[PDB]
Amino acid sequence: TLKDITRRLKSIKNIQKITKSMKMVAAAKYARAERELKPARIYGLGSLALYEKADIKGPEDKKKHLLIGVSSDRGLCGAIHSSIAKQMKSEVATLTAAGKEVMLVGIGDKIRGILYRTHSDQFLVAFKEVGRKPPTFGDASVIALELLNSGYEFDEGSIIFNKFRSVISYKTEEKPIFSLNTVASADSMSIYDDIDADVLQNYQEYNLANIIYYSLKE
Amino acid sequence: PAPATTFAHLDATTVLSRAIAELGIYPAVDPLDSTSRIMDPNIVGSEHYDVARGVQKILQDYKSLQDIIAILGMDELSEEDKLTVSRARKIQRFLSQPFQVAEVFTGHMGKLVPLKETIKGFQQILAGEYDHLPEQAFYMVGPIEEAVAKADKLAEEH
Amino acid sequence: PAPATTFAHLDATTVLSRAIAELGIYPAVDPLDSTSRIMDPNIVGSEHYDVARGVQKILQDYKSLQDIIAILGMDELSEEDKLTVSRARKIQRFLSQPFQVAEVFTGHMGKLVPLKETIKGFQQILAGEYDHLPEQAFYMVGPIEEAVAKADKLA
Amino acid sequence: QMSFTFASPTQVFFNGANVRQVDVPTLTGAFGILAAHVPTLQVLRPGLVVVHAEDGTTSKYFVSSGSIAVNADSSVQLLAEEAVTLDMLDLGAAKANLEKAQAELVGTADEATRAEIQIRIEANEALVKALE
Amino acid sequence: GAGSIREAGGAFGKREQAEEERYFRAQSREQLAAL
Amino acid sequence: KQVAGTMKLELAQYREVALLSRGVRLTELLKQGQYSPMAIEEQVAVIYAGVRGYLDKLEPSKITKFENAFLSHVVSQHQALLGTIRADGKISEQSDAKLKEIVTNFLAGF
Amino acid sequence: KQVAGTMKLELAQYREVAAFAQFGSDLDAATQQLLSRGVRLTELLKQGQYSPMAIEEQVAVIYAGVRGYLDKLEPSKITKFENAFLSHVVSQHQALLGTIRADGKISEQSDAKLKEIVTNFLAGFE
Amino acid sequence: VAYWRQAGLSYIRYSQICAKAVRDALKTEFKANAEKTSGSNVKIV
C-alpha cells in the first residue's frame, strides 16, 4: 500500500534525523571528557599507587562486603549498564556463596533500576543526577560522605566501572576498597612512618573519594 | 476526488479523524485539519483568534516533540518541553465534550459550553493556570469549572 | 488473483518465503503464513496443539520486536525480550531441515523426523532446556539429539 | 632519585618529576621531603607547598586538603583537593572571611557546627599567613 | 512529518504512546495526592 | 451492560499502557475455545470474577484453567443464582453478594 | 539584494543545522548562534494577512535582522518589535525610507543612518 | 585525633570546608571558573 509505505518512510526518516543529532551531541560530550580524563587518570591512579607498592592484599576472611557500581542515569549507552549490572550480579553471587553479607551501591539510576528488583534486600544507598553533567570531585566527596555516614562498617569493598580503552573499546574493570583494619593490620604497612589509626582513618576516607572520582571519570 | 472536490464548496470544514477517535476523544474533530473562513481576527475578535492559534501551535509542537519522545523517552526532555507536552495533552482532553445525543455511548450528561467559556478555559490552560491539575480532569467536561470540580472529586476519591 | 483465489480451495497451505529462503532456512516455509484445518486440539491432541501454538506465538513476538531490533540494536531490549528473541531464533533454525532430495546440491544427508520427535524437540526449545546451546547448532539438523550433538561438535 | 607527583582533581602540576625537595603542610605538622626519605603517608591541612627543582628554583603552590605518600622507591604522590598557585588568591577576601568565621564562632553554640566554624577559621588563618 | 513516528503505528509509535502514558499517569498520581 | 462497561474501560486503559496486570487478566479472560459458546449469565459471572479483583493474584497461565473449572463449579451447584440472573436480566445486590460469596469461596478452594 | 543574499545564506545554514534544535544547548557556540539567527530570521518573515509591505520597509526590517540587531532580543518579541520599529521608521524617518526607495539601494549614508536608527530604537525598546 | 574528629566529622567534610574556603579567597577573575569545575550535582535517593 502506497500510504503504508509513505507513513513508514516518514517515521524512519525522522528516526534517522533524531539519531544523527543525538550522535552529534554524544560526540561533543565525548570530547571534553577524553581531555578531562588525562589529569583524572594521573590523579586517580596516583591514589592507588600506595596499595600497589605496599601491596595490600585485603582480608580473605572477613564477612561484610560493599559493592559500588558506577553508571549513569541516561540510557541508549548500549552495553554500558548491562556490563556493570552483569558484574555486580556475578560478584553478589560469588560473595554470598561464601556467606559474606553484601551491600550494594549504585551511582546512577540505570544500575539501580536494573538491580532493584532481583536485589532489593542487598542494597544500601543509590545516587542520581549522574551523566547529565560531567562528574566532579564535588560528586565524589558527596558519595563518600553518605557512605561513611551510613553505619555500615564494611570489612572490604569493590568498585565496578567501565575502564575506557579506546573510542570503540571499553572494559568493565574493578578496583578494591580497603577498610581501616585491613591497612592498619597489614604487615607491609610497618615500613610506613608516623602512622597511627587516626592518620589511616583520614587517608582511607580520602581514598574512598579518590576511587569514586576516578571511576566516575572512567 | 469526491472529498477533495467537495472541499472547495464549503465555508467551514470539520474533519473527523480516526487517530483521534481511537484516543477516546469525542468529537473526533482534527484540530490541525479543520478550517473556517471566519477564523479571522477582524471577525471573531483578536482574543478568540489568538487563543485558537495558540492551541493549534501547541498541538503542532506536541506532534513535533512526540518523535523525540519516542527516541529519547520522556525523562530526557527539556523542562519547557515537558510543560509543552503537559499543556498539549490537557488541551487535547479539553477539546473533548460529552454530547446530549451520545448519552447512551458514554453514560455522561450533555454539556453545551458557551463561546466565552470556551475561549476563557483554553486561554487559562495555555497560560499555565492549571498545571497542577491532572489531565484526566479535562476529559469529557464542559466549562473549566467542571474540570476543576472533577479534579477535586478525583482527588477526594484517591 | 490466482493464488488469492486458490487459497479457498485448500485444506492445508504451505507458504514458502523468499525472505526466509535467503536466510538459509530450508524449506522456506513461512511459519506465520502456513495453515491447516486439522490444527485443532481434538484432532492433533492438546500437546501437539499447544506446542504449535506456543511456537507460533514466540515467532510472532520476535516479528513484533524486529523493528526495535533493527534500528536500536539488540542492547535496548529487556531481559525477557532478549530471552524470547534467543528462543525464537533457535526455533527458527530448528524449523529448517535437510531433505533427502536436496543432498545432490548440499552433500548433507537428508533427515526424516517423526512427529513425536518434532513435538518433543520444539517443546524442549520452548521450555528453555537448550538456552545454552549456540543458535547455529539447530540449523539443518533432524531431531533435537542431532542438535545437541552438533552443539557438542562445535565446542 | 625522587620521582614526584603533584596533582589535583583536574590539574597535574608534576608527574614523575625529579625534584630535590618538597615541603608539605601535614595534619601532624609540616615536613620537607628529599630523596630516599623514610616511607610515610599523611593527609594535609591548608598551607603552602614548596617544590625545589634540581636547578635550585622554588615553585610555591597552596593546597587545601589531600594526601601525601612517600614510598620505599623514593616516589612521592601528593594529591591535593584544591591546588592553586599563590598569585590566584587575594588577601582581602581572606581577612574578610576570617572575621566572619570568627564572628560566627563566638555566636555559635552547637559542638559539631562550631567545629565546622573552626575548620573554616584555620582555613583562612593559613590563607592570610601563607599569602603575606 | 512531525508526528510521523506515531502516525505510522508500529513498534516505535506504540512504545512512544506507552512511555507518554507511563510518565503522565505517574504525574497524575503525584498531582492528585497533592490536592 | 454493568460488567462490560467496567471491562471496556479497563481494557482501554490497559491498551493505553502496553493497571497492566488487571488488563492482562482481562485479555486472557476474553479468550475462548472454539465451538464453546457460553450463556449470558456465565459470561457475566466470569467478567465479574475478572473485573471485581478476584483474579488479580492468579498466574496468567492458570487463568484459563481457573475459568473453566470455575464455570463447572457454578453450573454444578448454583443453577438457582444463574436462573435468577438470567430471568432478571440484571444483577441485584442480593445476587451480587451471593456470587461474591461464590467466587470468594471458590478462589479460596482453588 | 544586499539584505536578501545574507538572509538566504543564514537561513540555509539554519536549515542545515535545524534538526539539532531540541538539543541546541549541547553543541558549539557556532551551532547555537546559527540556530538563534535562524529563528530570528524565521520570525522576521511572518506577516499578517491583507497587509503588504513596501520594499523600503521590508529592506529596513531585513537589515535589522541580518545585521545582528535582534540576537540579544528573545524570539517571542521579534514580531512585536518588527511592528513597533516599523511604526517608528514610518513616523519619524520618512527621509531614509524615501531615499532608499528613490535610490533602490542602501548607500553608505543610508547604511549608517539605518544603523543609528536601529540601534537607538533597540536600546530604547521595552 | 583532631578536634573535629571528636566532634564527629570526617576528613571528607574537613576537606570540603577547607577546599571551599580556599575557593572563596580566590580573586573574582578565577572565582567563577573554579566554582564551576568543583561543584556538586549528585543527589542521594
Side-chain angles (χ1 to χ4, degrees):
Chain A
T1 293
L2 203 47
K3 266 181 192 261
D4 264 358
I5 299 170
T6 303
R7 281 188 224 279
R8 195 163 160 81
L9 262 169
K10 281 169 161 55
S11 157
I12 299 176
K13 290 185 185 197
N14 260 354
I15 279 167
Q16 193 260 330
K17 270 191 284 291
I18 304 182
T19 53
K20 189 63 57 191
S21 87
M22 298 184 44
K23 170 187 177 67
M24 288 308 297
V25 162
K29 289 190 182 179
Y30 164 58
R32 98 182 165 189
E34 197 178 11
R35 282 187 265 100
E36 284 183 334
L37 182 67
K38 304 191 184 314
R41 185 166 275 179
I42 300 299
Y43 162 97
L45 292 184
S47 287
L48 318 174
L50 186 88
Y51 307 132
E52 183 178 2
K53 292 168 174 49
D55 194 277
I56 315 304
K57 280 278 180 35
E60 72 294 339
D61 313 326
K62 295 322 296 152
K63 325 310 291 211
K64 302 182 70 180
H65 197 116
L66 180 77
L67 194 39
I68 293 165
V70 177
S71 61
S72 72
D73 280 5
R74 289 184 43 100
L76 291 153
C77 303
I80 295 285
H81 315 282
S82 87
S83 312
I84 296 300
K86 184 161 47 64
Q87 191 69 269
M88 287 175 79
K89 288 185 222 159
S90 297
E91 287 200 41
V92 160
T94 313
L95 298 177
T96 42
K100 302 193 184 295
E101 170 59 34
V102 182
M103 284 275 210
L104 300 189
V105 174
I107 308 175
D109 208 295
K110 286 309 183 190
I111 182 56
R112 182 199 64 182
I114 297 175
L115 281 189
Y116 205 81
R117 293 96 60 87
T118 78
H119 302 281
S120 49
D121 50 281
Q122 305 206 347
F123 183 79
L124 166 52
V125 186
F127 297 78
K128 209 179 61 70
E129 275 291 331
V130 196
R132 285 185 201 82
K133 313 300 298 176
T136 46
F137 202 85
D139 305 82
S141 44
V142 167
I143 306 170
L145 273 175
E146 281 88 10
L147 270 170
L148 306 163
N149 293 6
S150 90
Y152 178 73
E153 46 165 354
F154 55 95
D155 298 356
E156 63 209 297
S158 297
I159 199 155
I160 313 182
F161 64 105
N162 284 283
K163 171 78 174 176
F164 166 69
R165 294 182 28 188
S166 188
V167 181
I168 308 312
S169 158
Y170 67 89
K171 179 192 248 185
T172 291
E173 270 207 355
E174 179 210 22
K175 294 270 168 48
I177 287 183
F178 306 117
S179 177
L180 176 144
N181 298 17
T182 295
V183 187
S185 316
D187 281 339
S188 173
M189 294 299 305
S190 84
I191 69 161
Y192 285 90
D193 177 29
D194 213 317
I195 297 320
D196 42 358
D198 188 56
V199 76
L200 276 180
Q201 201 158 351
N202 307 341
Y203 188 83
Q204 288 310 119
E205 289 173 3
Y206 193 77
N207 263 6
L208 173 72
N210 265 355
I211 196 185
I212 282 173
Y213 165 77
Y214 173 60
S215 289
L216 287 178
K217 305 305 277 201
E218 297 268 17
Chain B
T5 315
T6 304
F7 264 111
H9 280 107
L10 312 168
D11 294 324
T13 78
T14 292
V15 182
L16 310 177
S17 199
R18 186 168 313 280
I20 296 194
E22 291 176 318
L23 285 176
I25 289 152
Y26 285 116
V29 181
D30 197 338
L32 296 186
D33 203 77
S34 284
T35 310
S36 192
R37 288 185 193 168
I38 59 170
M39 186 33 67
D40 176 27
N42 303 325
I43 301 174
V44 285
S46 315
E47 170 173 352
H48 189 142
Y49 179 80
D50 279 342
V51 170
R53 289 321 190 204
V55 166
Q56 285 174 330
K57 178 171 177 176
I58 198 172
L59 284 173
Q60 185 67 56
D61 293 357
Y62 183 30
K63 272 186 155 189
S64 193
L65 295 180
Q66 276 169 327
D67 312 323
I68 302 308
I69 292 174
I71 307 310
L72 276 71
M74 193 88 200
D75 46 324
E76 281 297 326
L77 273 185
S78 158
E79 283 299 5
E80 300 69 39
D81 294 322
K82 295 178 187 182
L83 199 61
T84 303
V85 172
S86 293
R87 291 170 177 169
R89 291 172 59 95
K90 292 188 193 205
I91 283 172
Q92 271 195 35
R93 324 286 154 173
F94 197 50
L95 284 160
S96 176
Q97 171 168 351
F99 279 170
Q100 201 271 301
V101 310
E103 286 199 33
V104 286
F105 296 132
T106 59
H108 291 169
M109 211 75 217
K111 289 309 173 194
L112 193 141
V113 185
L115 176 59
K116 319 200 179 176
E117 283 317 303
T118 294
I119 310 182
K120 164 184 162 304
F122 277 107
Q123 215 164 359
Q124 289 175 5
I125 302 182
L126 275 174
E129 208 151 336
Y130 299 108
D131 273 308
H132 60 283
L133 298 172
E135 71 207 16
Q136 294 311 327
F138 305 92
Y139 185 76
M140 290 301 185
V141 291
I144 195 75
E145 41 176 6
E146 298 206 16
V148 179
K150 197 193 177 190
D152 293 0
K153 183 190 253 215
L154 263 55
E156 172 202 359
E157 181 205 307
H158 204 170
Chain C
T5 309
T6 305
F7 266 114
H9 289 278
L10 310 168
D11 293 320
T13 74
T14 299
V15 176
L16 314 175
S17 199
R18 194 176 312 265
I20 299 195
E22 292 205 8
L23 295 167
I25 296 167
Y26 285 112
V29 185
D30 196 353
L32 298 182
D33 217 328
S34 299
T35 80
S36 184
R37 297 186 187 181
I38 72 169
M39 184 40 63
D40 168 41
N42 288 88
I43 310 173
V44 285
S46 313
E47 178 200 38
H48 185 164
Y49 182 70
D50 278 333
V51 172
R53 284 307 181 223
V55 167
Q56 281 175 320
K57 171 176 188 178
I58 191 170
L59 288 172
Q60 182 55 59
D61 287 357
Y62 181 37
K63 181 178 269 190
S64 297
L65 288 165
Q66 295 284 27
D67 270 298
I68 303 183
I69 295 179
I71 287 191
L72 283 184
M74 198 64 202
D75 282 306
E76 212 78 3
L77 302 182
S78 89
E79 276 327 290
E80 293 322 315
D81 280 350
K82 280 164 190 159
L83 182 44
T84 190
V85 167
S86 188
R87 276 177 199 172
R89 300 181 52 136
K90 288 187 188 73
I91 293 169
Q92 270 194 353
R93 320 278 173 156
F94 196 59
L95 283 163
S96 76
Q97 175 177 353
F99 279 170
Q100 214 282 335
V101 307
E103 302 169 336
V104 298
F105 49 82
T106 191
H108 303 310
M109 312 295 218
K111 294 303 171 186
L112 189 137
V113 193
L115 184 41
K116 287 256 198 74
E117 309 302 314
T118 305
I119 305 159
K120 172 184 90 86
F122 281 103
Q123 193 168 17
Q124 289 177 357
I125 304 180
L126 272 176
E129 294 178 40
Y130 300 104
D131 302 358
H132 49 269
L133 301 189
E135 83 196 0
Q136 214 68 38
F138 299 88
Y139 178 80
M140 281 299 167
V141 306
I144 193 82
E145 290 96 14
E146 304 195 21
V148 176
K150 177 173 186 150
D152 281 336
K153 184 213 81 53
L154 281 195
Chain D
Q1 174 74 12
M2 165 158 141
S3 53
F4 190 46
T5 295
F6 181 46
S8 172
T10 186
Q11 190 159 20
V12 289
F13 299 78
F14 295 83
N15 178 19
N18 292 124
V19 295
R20 68 159 290 268
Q21 199 204 315
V22 166
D23 299 18
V24 303
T26 292
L27 285 181
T28 74
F31 63 90
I33 304 147
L34 284 91
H37 183 287
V38 53
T40 194
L41 69 89
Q42 308 279 328
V43 281
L44 325 174
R45 86 189 157 211
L48 283 149
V49 163
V50 185
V51 181
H52 300 273
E54 278 291 335
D55 57 5
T57 75
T58 74
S59 317
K60 298 172 67 180
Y61 314 86
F62 184 95
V63 309
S64 61
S65 48
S67 88
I68 185 71
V70 193
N71 274 123
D73 50 11
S74 301
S75 57
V76 189
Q77 289 97 21
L78 171 52
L79 305 178
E81 175 176 20
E82 186 87 45
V84 295
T85 306
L86 209 51
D87 59 1
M88 293 173 32
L89 292 152
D90 73 326
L91 311 94
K95 299 167 181 47
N97 283 93
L98 179 49
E99 172 64 281
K100 312 176 182 181
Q102 279 148 342
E104 278 195 341
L105 162 62
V106 178
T108 199
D110 192 25
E111 181 196 30
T113 60
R114 179 179 300 207
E116 317 188 29
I117 304 302
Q118 268 278 358
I119 289 184
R120 192 163 64 259
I121 288 181
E122 320 165 358
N124 305 302
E125 317 194 339
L127 286 170
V128 307
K129 207 164 307 173
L131 277 167
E132 270 102 334
Chain E
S4 53
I5 304 183
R6 202 196 164 180
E7 175 186 0
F12 275 114
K14 295 180 299 192
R15 81 180 289 175
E16 194 274 350
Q17 194 194 197
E19 191 80 338
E20 286 235 3
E21 295 298 327
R22 200 260 302 284
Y23 186 100
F24 283 98
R25 283 164 182 259
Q27 190 162 103
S28 302
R29 187 162 310 282
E30 269 75 345
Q31 265 191 355
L32 281 170
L35 212 66
Chain F
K1 206 178 314 186
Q2 309 158 16
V3 306
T6 72
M7 186 187 214
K8 169 165 167 287
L9 183 54
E10 285 209 283
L11 283 171
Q13 280 166 357
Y14 166 65
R15 285 179 272 112
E16 292 157 54
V17 297
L19 188 53
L20 214 65
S21 75
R22 178 80 71 112
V24 161
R25 264 91 178 164
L26 282 186
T27 291
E28 273 69 14
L29 209 70
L30 290 170
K31 309 181 182 184
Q32 187 167 352
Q34 200 167 348
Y35 310 120
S36 298
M38 297 151 52
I40 195 63
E41 66 263 20
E42 321 181 21
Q43 288 192 55
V44 159
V46 172
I47 312 295
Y48 173 106
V51 74
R52 308 277 208 245
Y54 299 97
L55 298 181
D56 289 319
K57 75 96 170 180
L58 318 174
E59 274 190 79
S61 84
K62 313 311 279 215
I63 290 173
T64 294
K65 185 185 181 63
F66 168 93
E67 201 206 309
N68 53 280
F70 184 25
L71 279 192
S72 309
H73 173 54
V74 194
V75 311
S76 52
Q77 308 289 339
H78 321 320
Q79 290 299 137
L81 168 66
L82 295 203
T84 318
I85 299 175
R86 179 201 318 121
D88 262 348
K90 48 167 176 170
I91 56 170
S92 53
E93 292 317 276
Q94 180 138 346
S95 296
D96 198 345
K98 184 153 201 263
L99 60 97
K100 175 267 294 189
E101 292 294 328
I102 296 289
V103 66
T104 301
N105 182 89
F106 186 86
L107 193 82
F110 190 76
Chain G
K1 214 171 304 184
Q2 288 179 51
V3 300
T6 307
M7 181 173 224
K8 179 188 285 286
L9 261 63
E10 297 192 270
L11 280 171
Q13 303 156 180
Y14 170 60
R15 281 196 307 271
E16 292 179 354
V17 311
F20 306 150
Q22 202 38 266
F23 309 104
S25 64
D26 283 88
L27 305 94
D28 293 330
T31 299
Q32 298 192 43
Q33 181 51 227
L34 285 194
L35 288 154
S36 314
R37 188 60 78 78
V39 310
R40 261 95 195 173
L41 299 173
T42 296
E43 269 78 63
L44 198 66
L45 290 184
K46 305 177 181 189
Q47 187 165 342
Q49 210 185 357
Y50 316 115
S51 73
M53 291 177 47
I55 189 51
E56 54 256 38
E57 312 174 66
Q58 297 184 48
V59 172
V61 156
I62 307 306
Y63 187 98
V66 304
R67 287 313 178 79
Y69 284 117
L70 291 171
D71 273 317
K72 210 203 177 273
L73 188 50
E74 62 100 18
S76 313
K77 306 301 303 191
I78 299 290
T79 311
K80 183 141 182 103
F81 163 86
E82 199 273 305
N83 265 307
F85 174 68
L86 212 62
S87 278
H88 176 81
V89 195
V90 164
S91 44
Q92 314 161 200
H93 296 307
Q94 280 299 134
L96 184 52
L97 298 175
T99 302
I100 288 190
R101 170 182 69 250
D103 304 0
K105 68 188 183 196
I106 315 171
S107 74
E108 281 62 28
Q109 293 81 16
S110 297
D111 190 301
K113 182 96 190 306
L114 266 171
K115 185 66 67 179
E116 322 303 357
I117 295 175
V118 176
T119 179
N120 292 176
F121 183 90
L122 161 76
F125 176 70
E126 272 87 329
Chain H
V1 196
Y3 60 101
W4 41 263
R5 177 61 66 184
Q6 284 112 22
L9 289 201
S10 57
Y11 195 79
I12 306 289
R13 196 71 187 91
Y14 176 96
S15 62
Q16 282 170 197
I17 301 169
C18 279
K20 177 174 213 334
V22 175
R23 256 182 287 123
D24 292 334
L26 281 159
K27 52 186 54 180
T28 319
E29 205 276 347
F30 300 99
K31 174 166 185 182
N33 181 31
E35 173 68 29
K36 182 263 298 178
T37 322
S38 298
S40 68
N41 320 110
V42 68
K43 299 193 310 182
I44 310 102
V45 309

